[PDB]
């Protein structure tokens, strides 16, 4: 399996991290700030062969798309961003329903 | 829902999605006269550039 | 020289029936698309008639 | 009325089970077409009229299609929920108005 | 032999023309500067396919 | 052994032309092989389009 198929295989196997390949063929991982806490520790023979650097924090503003690596990382950033905005919307919706029951209960 | 007179938020929703529907057919009806998906930079930003380059 | 000049003139000025007919048919379909969408576009103000009526 | 509301949740859940297996089987439809193509190539390569070079040509087609089969297996998903990669396992779809009325669905 | 050679040299110079000028919207293909690029054919990140033309 | 390619093809003599027939035989295999490699990629993408649409 080449790098691109390795990125796809890592994507399918686990949903916590997302793998992608850059311009030069460099496997970049993305651990969402909402699903993981603290740094990621990478080991194994493949980790030693590929080599992995420190974890840099990125957001929607830090998204650069002028490079293919930045756009591949971008899809993962806005996936964690969409899950973030949807998470709070469900909280607000359950709150609207909660006061919907509170309003009716108060009326009775 | 206190049955009101001055405010008709149900109709505001109706005309809001009416606005989206009226606009939505305007894009399609424009696209079909010309025969182009990208009639302007609105639809596909880079798609306009690469199509123009092609 | 006359034979080769005539061939050159045909390449520059004489029409290409294969390409021109395709352009004519495509233009014909384009107009028929425009009349169909224009006919549907003229009834848009009629959708504004139902609100007050 | 509790049963009635539960039955709508059962119709909704069973509809989800229908759609999940619909997406999985649709990918299986293309997998059948790919494997039939690779079988056409395999029969063609077995001919004695083919020297070494055209066998490499068939191998290039077969290898490209083989990586495509792994691609479909590792990318087909239901809203990010992978199906054909073997990580779905056996999951139960509750189609009743009372707890414990599910149906087990498994695909290899 | 030089009559054949003169045409062979013209054809050889034509092969370099095809290699150096064939481009896709200003992106040269056959000149060897294309390299390997990942074509993203999935609905999620990291689902691309490597394509390379020498 | 000195390296020879299609550029060094010089048919001005029988030795250069006899080698030339063999050099382009090696070149035609290179072109045909990468054409077939591209063709496998194109069919791979055609099946991907059908699966993605499905």
Question: Which of D33, D53, D64 lies at the smallest CB-CB distance from F40?
Answer: D64
> Rounded to a whole number, what is the distance in Å from the CA of E12 to chain A's nearest CA?
33
Q: Judge contact between D72 and D27, C-beta under 8 A.
A: yes
Calpha distance F28→B54 (Å, rounded): 30
- At C48, is the secondary structure helix, strand, or coil? coil
E49: left (phi over 0), alpha (psi -120 to 50) or beta: beta
Are F and B neighbours with ≥3 CB pairs closer than 8 A? no
Q: Judge contact between A18 and A11, C-beta under 8 A.
A: yes
D54-65: b (≥16 Cβ within 10 Å) or e: eebbbebbbebb
> Rounded to a whole number, what is the distance in Å from the CA of A47 to chain E's nearest CA?
18
Calpha distance F52→D29 (Å, rounded): 12
Residue E15 burial by CB count (10 A; 0-12/13-18/19+): exposed, middle or buried?
middle
Mutate to test the interface with B, among E25, E26, E28, E29 (most CBs of B within 10 A): E25
Cα separations (Å) of E38 from A42, A69, F45?
A: 25, 10, 13
Q: Judge contact between A44 and A27, C-beta under 8 A.
A: no
Q: Judge contact between A77 and A30, C-beta under 8 A.
A: yes
Q: Dig out the tokens for B36 from the structure.
A: 């182009």
Calpha distance A65→A75 (Å, rounded): 10
Contacts for E12 with CB less than 8 Å, ≥ 6 apart: F6, F7, F9
Contact residues, chain F, for D56 at CB < 8 Å: 33
Mutate to test the interface with C, among B24, B25, B31, B33 (most CBs of C within 10 A): B33
CA angle D6, D10, D14 (to 5 degrees): 175
> Rounded to a whole number, what is the distance in Å from the CA of D85 to chain E's nearest CA?
14
Record the resolution, in angstroms.
3.2
**Residue A43 C-beta-side C-alpha neighbours within 13 Å:** 1
Calpha distance D71→A60 (Å, rounded): 29
Rg from Cα positions in chain E:
18
């Amino acid at each position: 399996d080449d790098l691109e198929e390795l990125a796809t295989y890592i994507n399918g196997q686990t949903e916590d991290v997302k793998a992608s390949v850059g311009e030069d063929g460099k496997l970049q991982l993305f651990a969402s700030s909402q699903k993981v806490n603290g740094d990621v520790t990478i080991g194994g023979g493949l980790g030693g062969e590929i080599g992995f650097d420190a974890g840099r924090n990125v957001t929607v503003a830090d998204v650069n798309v002028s490079t293919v690596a930045g756009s591949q990382e971008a899809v993962s950033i806005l996936d964690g961003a969409l899950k973030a905005v949807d998470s709070q919307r469900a909280s607000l919706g359950a709150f609207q329903n909660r006061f919907g029951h509170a309003i009716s209960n108060l009326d009775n | 829902m206190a049955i009101n007179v001055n405010t008709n938020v149900s109709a505001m929703t109706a005309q809001r999605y009416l606005n989206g529907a009226a606009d939505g057919m305007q894009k399609s009806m424009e696209r079909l006269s010309s025969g182009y998906k990208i009639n302007s930079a609105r639809d596909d930003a880079a798609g306009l550039q690469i199509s123009n380059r092609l | 020289v006359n034979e080769n000049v005539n061939a050159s003139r045909s390449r520059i000025r004489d029409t290409d029936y294969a390409r021109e007919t395709t352009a004519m048919t495509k233009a014909q379909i384009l107009q028929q698309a425009s009349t169909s969408v224009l006919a549907q576009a003229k009834q848009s103000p009629s959708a504004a008639l139902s609100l007050l009526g | 009325t509790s049963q009635s509301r539960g039955l709508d949740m059962a119709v909704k859940n069973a509809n989800d089970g229908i759609s999940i297996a619909q997406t999985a089987e649709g990918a299986m439809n293309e997998t059948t077409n790919i494997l039939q193509r690779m079988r056409d190539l395999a029969l063609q390569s077995s001919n004695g009229s083919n020297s070494s070079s055209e066998r490499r040509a068939i191998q290039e087609e077969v290898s490209a299609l083989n990586d495509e089969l792994n691609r479909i297996a590792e990318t087909t998903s239901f809203g990010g929920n992978k199906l054909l990669n073997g990580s779905f396992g056996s999951k139960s779809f509750q189609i009743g108005a009372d707890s414990g009325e599910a149906v087990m669905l498994s695909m290899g």
